[PDB]
Amino acid sequence: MQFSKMHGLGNDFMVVDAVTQNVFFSPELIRRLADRHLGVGFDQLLVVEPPYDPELDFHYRIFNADGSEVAQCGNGARCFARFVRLKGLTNKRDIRVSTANGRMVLTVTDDDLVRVNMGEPNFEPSAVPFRANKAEKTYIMRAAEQTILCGVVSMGNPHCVIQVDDVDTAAVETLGPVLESHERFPERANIGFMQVVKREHIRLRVYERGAGETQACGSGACAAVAVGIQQGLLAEEVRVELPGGRLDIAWKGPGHPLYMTGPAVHVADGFIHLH
Amino acid sequence: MQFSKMHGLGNDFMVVDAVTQNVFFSPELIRRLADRHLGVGFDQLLVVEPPYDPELDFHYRIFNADGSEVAQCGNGARCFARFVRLKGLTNKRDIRVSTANGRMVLTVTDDDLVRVNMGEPNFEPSAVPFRANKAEKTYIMRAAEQTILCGVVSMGNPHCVIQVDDVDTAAVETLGPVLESHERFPERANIGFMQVVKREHIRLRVYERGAGETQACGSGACAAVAVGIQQGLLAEEVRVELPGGRLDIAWKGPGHPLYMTGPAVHVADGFIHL
């Protein structure tokens, strides 16, 4: 089976064209292939399929390293869009695709970055889920000794965004775990540490739900900007610098979808003899 | 640049043909390619090269994930041998190679395993290095309050081999560290915990020098079997079961080379755009 290795800022995928070859998986085979030593090695598997509705260009689905299907808006979208072009499955720049989360259009920019519609940020505490009295722009939380001021928002997944003086001195490793499975987040949360450089530029570190700190969390970048916009700190177009590189978020505010633009890197192609 | 991904009992390699391809590396490039998220992902890089000598078939060298060259006996040998055969670079059953550790002949068996000549085990304490009065079949060591009976041998690198009742109950995580950097090992040691199932069959766990417990340490399998043979415990052909899988060791004793036979798995081929 042909595959490609790709990443969106360190988030790695095995990407497989299921249009021009037969692609067969079991949960067990995915687990074996994901193994860094025994297999190809990847966080997630991205399968690119022909469309099942004639109004679309493709369908894609994503499995995690455990072999089960993942349904998170925007997950794998940038690698998806560059893959179909690099493989010559399409030469379209605006690509209509169905996913586990519905349909969307992806756009590949003049600089070969990909723009993803991430939907409208949902600040309703029950949608997070977050235990609170009601939606507020800023909440008070306790992390043992410390008083934390944060915003909270859903991007399809839960985020807790804390403003910091300097991401490099932020106490990610000690505050992250505490907030990540705080009692007030029944389904845990991604914890963002956001430094506002100016209205159009932040630096961000993210302690991810069930993973701790990684090089880049795209939905966390979305959340931190949505929260900074709602707190009146940020303009409607914001550059986000994560440890793994740059994203740009555009959001005109409540009533609007939020857009995330970023790179996807094609690392290598390969073949695995599966018979 | 084409490459293959391979592993020898979980020990993984990017392997590259620099015989039929022009292949160029820098320390930085190796670091990037080793990176599991940003690159191909591997513990070590194995580069296959021409011999520049008609008494040899190939040279190979190995780099670690920091980008520096590694010189450990038997390291990568089985992946190397199946690679050159699978890629059609040779069809020889017995392949002559030079490496950073000298020359040897590798044999690819009828069942697609590879037999490596690991040289003669050296039980001399000064060769390990190991502090003792003289070479002994069994030494008494102290690991804090615990008395340890062990055998000690060099396979090109230092090993301390302890017989246990059951590898699953062996105190690898506590004794391993204490023994690995014991004062009696000036350059530290690989610590093997060997359970004798039968004279032809052992189970083995190895707390590696500088690394701690690994799924498979081939030189540790040779050393355990060398020690067990010398202690009168083991037959001359021994099945070794490590966490990562099976090796077969064969040794006729002093004055003889010890042979290690094991698998090498071809995981995938690939191309990386340079």
Domain spans of chain A, in order of start: 1-114+262-275, 115-139+150-261
Determine the Cα–Cα distance for residues B143 and A174; give it in Å rounded to an integer: 36
Determine the Cα–Cα distance for residues B98 and A56; give it in Å rounded to an integer: 57
Determine the Cα–Cα distance for residues B35 and B38; give it in Å rounded to an integer: 5
- Distance in Å, alpha carbon of A56 to nearest chain B alpha carbon: 31
Q: Which of B43, B266, B271 sits opposite A269 (nearest CB)?
A: B271
Query: What are the start-end ranges of the H helices in chain A?
Result: 27-34, 77-86, 172-180, 218-230
Cα A32 to its chain centre, rounded Å, is 24
- Written as six digits, the tokens of A203 are 């630096």
Determine the Cα–Cα distance for residues B16 and B1; give it in Å rounded to an integer: 8
Q: What is the DSSP annotation of chain B? A: -EEEEEEETTEEEEEEE-SSS-----HHHHHHHH-TTTS---SEEEEEE--SSTT-SEEEEEEETTS-EE--TTTTHHHHHHHHHHTTS---SEEEEEETTEEEEEEE-TTS-EEEE----B--GGGTT---SS--SSEEEEETTEEEEEEEEESSSEEEEEEES-TTTS-HHHHHHHHHT-TT-TT--EEEEEEEEETTEEEEEEEETTTEEES--HHHHHHHHHHHHHTT-S-SEEEEEETTEEEEEEE--TTS-EEEEE--EEEEEEE---
Q: Which residues of A touch B37 (CB under 8 A)?
A: 7, 10-12, 43, 215
Determine the Cα–Cα distance for residues A62 and B80; give it in Å rounded to an integer: 35
Yes or no: say if B35 and B41 are a contact pair by the CB < 8 Å rule: yes
Cα A72 to its chain centre, rounded Å, is 8
Known catalytic membership, residue A217:
yes
Q: Is the peptide bond before B129 cis (omega within 30 degrees of 0)?
A: yes
Do the annotations mark residue A122 as ligand-binding? no
Do the annotations mark residue A208 as ligand-binding? yes
- Written as six digits, the tokens of A43 are 């966080």
- Written as six digits, the tokens of A273 are 């003899």
Give the 3-state secondary structure of residue A136.
coil
Annotated catalytic residue within A73, A79, A150, A222: A73
Q: Determine whether domain B1-114+262-274 maps to CATH 3.10.310.10.
A: yes
Q: How many CA atoms lie within 13 A of B202 on its CB side?
A: 35
Give the 3-state secondary structure of residue A102.
strand
Cβ pair A37:B273 closer than 8 A: no
Residue type, A256: H
Q: Which helix (H) or strand (E) holds A128?
A: none
What is the domain class of B115-139+150-261 according to CATH?
alpha beta
Q: Determine whether domain A1-114+262-275 maps to CATH 3.50.50.60.
A: no
Place of tokens 């530029």: A201
**Which DSSP symbol is given to A172?**
H
Cα B203 to its chain centre, rounded Å, is 16
**Which DSSP symbol is given to A54?**
T
Cβ pair A270:B11 closer than 8 A: no
Whether B1-114+262-274 shares its CATH topology with B115-139+150-261 is answered: yes
Longest dimension (CA), chain B: 58
B232 Rama sector, left if φ>0, alpha if ψ -120 to 50, beta otherwise: left
Query: What is the experimental method?
Result: X-ray
Yes or no: say if A13 and A43 are a contact pair by the CB < 8 Å rule: yes
Determine the Cα–Cα distance for residues A203 and A194; give it in Å rounded to an integer: 6
